[PDB]
Q: What sequence folds into this?
C-alpha cells in the first residue's frame, strides 16, 4: 500500500504443464530422436 | 490530524478508552469521530502505473 | 514428509524477510522531531520543515 | 505570584482564538517552542496549563 506491487508472470502453470507433458509424451514414445530431428 | 483517503464503516471493537489504531508502518488505520461513537476505516485512494 | 522442498521455501523466505525489513525501516526517526511526514508538515512552518 | 510559590491554572472545555496575541504589542517577549505560533488556530488539545 506504500508503492509496492507484485506483477504477474507471463506463462501460467497450465502452459508449463502442457510443456512438461509434451516432453514426457515424446520421451516415452520416440527416444532421443525427437530432440535432434 | 489531516489526511486524504476513503472513509468507510468498520467492525473494529475499540474499547471505551481508545481513539485510533495504527498499522505496522506506524500510520493511522481507523478513527473514532468526535461527534459520533462509530468507528471508521481509512483506505488510500486508487493508483497505478 | 514436507521438509523435502527446503530450497524452494528458503528462496521465498529470504525475499520475504528483506521485503518486510524495507517497509519496517519506515518507522525510524533518523534524527527528525517526528516520523510522520504529515505531522511535521502540520505542526511546523515551511521554513522549518525542510 | 512569587517564584517560590508559582501559580498554576488548568483550562479545559474552551474555544479560544490566539490571533489577538499577535495583534497585541504589550509583551516584552513572546517565544514558543515545538509548535508554530500561527497555526494554533487549527489544533486541539486535551488540557492547557
Ligand atoms: C446539531 C448537532 O450537531 N448537535 C450535536 C449532536 O448531534 C451530538 O449528538 C451532540 C454530542 O452528543 O453534540 C451536539
A:
Amino acid at each position: 500500500f506504500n508503492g509496492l506491487t507484485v506483477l504477474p508472470p507471463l506463462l501460467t502453470d497450465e502452459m508449463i504443464a502442457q510443456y512438461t507433458s509434451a516432453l514426457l509424451a515424446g520421451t516415452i514414445t520416440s527416444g532421443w530422436t525427437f530432440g535432434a530431428g | 490530524l489531516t489526511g486524504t483517503g476513503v472513509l468507510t464503516e468498520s467492525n473494529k471493537k475499540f474499547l471505551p478508552f481508545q481513539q485510533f489504531g495504527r498499522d505496522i508502518a506506524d500510520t493511522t488505520d481507523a478513527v473514532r469521530d468526535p461527534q459520533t461513537l462509530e468507528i471508521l476505516d481509512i483506505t488510500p485512494c486508487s493508483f497505478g502505473g | 514428509t514436507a521438509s523435502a522442498l527446503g530450497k524452494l521455501q528458503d528462496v521465498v523466505n529470504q525475499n520475504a524477510q528483506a521485503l518486510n525489513t524495507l517497509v519496517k525501516q519506515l518507522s525510524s526517526n533518523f534524527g527528525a522531531i517526528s516520523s510522520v511526514l504529515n505531522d511535521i508538515l502540520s505542526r511546523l512552518d515551511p521554513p522549518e520543515a525542510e | 505570584a512569587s517564584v517560590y510559590a508559582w501559580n498554576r491554572k488548568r483550562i479545559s472545555n474552551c474555544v479560544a482564538d490566539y490571533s489577538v496575541l499577535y495583534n497585541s504589542a504589550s509583551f516584552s517577549t513572546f517565544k514558543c517552542y515545538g509548535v508554530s505560533p500561527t497555526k494554533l488556530n487549527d489544533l486541539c488539545f486535551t488540557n492547557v496549563y
Q: What stands out?
A: Helices of chain C lie at 6-24, 37-43, 46-49. Residues B 35 surround 2-acetamido-2-deoxy-beta-D-glucopyranose (CB under 6 Å).
